[PDB]
Design a protein around this ligand. Structure first.
Ligand SMILES: *[C@@H]1O[C@H](CO)[C@@H](O[C@@H]2O[C@H](CO)[C@@H](O)[C@H](O)[C@H]2NC(C)=O)[C@H](O)[C@H]1NC(C)=O
Ligand SMILES: *[C@@H]1O[C@H](CO)[C@@H](O[C@@H]2O[C@H](CO)[C@@H](O)[C@H](O)[C@H]2NC(C)=O)[C@H](O)[C@H]1NC(C)=O
Ligand SMILES: *[C@@H]1O[C@H](CO)[C@@H](O)[C@H](O)[C@H]1NC(C)=O
Ligand SMILES: *[C@@H]1O[C@H](CO)[C@@H](O)[C@H](O)[C@H]1NC(C)=O
Length: 161
């Protein structure tokens, strides 16, 4: 065992949902005030890391039917790799209306949107964006964390690195 055992994803204070892409593998989406990736980097230095990254986000967009509007906006994002299993952390700026509106055309916002509409946990506020069905979602959560993990382990945070 390397370093000390990781905290739980499934907590009384967290909102979480699991997307099962593979036969038992998938993505654990966690909305938290707990930071998992402690650096400011997302180094996709090789084609494999870039490929693992695109597959993770493609999975979320496909499953949630995210039609993300082009607002030329971005979420603060860290990523790391642990033997082929990616971790993606969004430092969400959705705590205030103005902040949410400027980080509205993002995957993280699409996830927040699904959590709200599916009632998966947590309370949110929907701001009418400029276009159709897309809402800018407010949340008090600081982090959205996405980890490639198994169903047996989805309730515990994986090691980022
Ligand atoms: C998201 O916010 C956390 C918290 O501020 C950032 O983690 C910090 O990273 C710096 C390195 O630049 C460390 O010196 C701090 O100790 C970290 N703080 C904590 C609480 O872990 C994280 O880097 C941010 N991620 C992004 C993408 O901005
Ligand atoms: C992500 O990449 C950056 C830059 O590619 C890394 O920062 C480098 O770290 C080395 C330490 O060996 C130092 O020379 C500098 O801090 C950076 N070098 C250059 C050329 O930018 C960073 O450590 C990487 N982090 C992760 C998690 O992969
Ligand atoms: C997360 O932190 C924000 C700001 O500190 C706070 O308002 C919010 O209630 C916290 N949420 C949880 C679930 O701890
Ligand atoms: C998790 O990682 C494995 C290999 O590291 C990959 O085959 C699989 O597609 C990944 N799962 C998701 C949901 O990205």
């Amino acid at each position: 065992t390397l370093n000390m055992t990781m905290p739980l994803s499934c907590t009384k204070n967290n909102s979480h949902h699991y997307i099962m892409v593979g036969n038992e593998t998938g993505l654990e989406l966690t909305l938290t005030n707990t930071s998992i990736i402690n650096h400011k980097f997302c180094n996709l230095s090789d084609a494999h890391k870039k490929n693992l990254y695109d597959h993770a986000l493609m999975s979320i967009i496909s499953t949630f039917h995210l039609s993300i509007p082009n607002f030329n906006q971005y979420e603060a994002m860290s990523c790391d790799f642990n033997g082929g299993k990616i971790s993606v952390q969004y430092n969400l700026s959705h705590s205030y209306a103005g902040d949410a509106a400027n980080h509205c055309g993002t995957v993280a916002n699409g996830v927040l949107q699904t959590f709200m509409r599916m009632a998966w946990g947590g309370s949110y506020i929907a701001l009418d964006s400029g276009r159709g069905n897309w809402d800018c979602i407010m949340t008090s959560y600081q982090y959205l964390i996405i980890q490639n993990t198994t169903w047996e382990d989805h309730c515990q945070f994986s090691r980022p690195s």
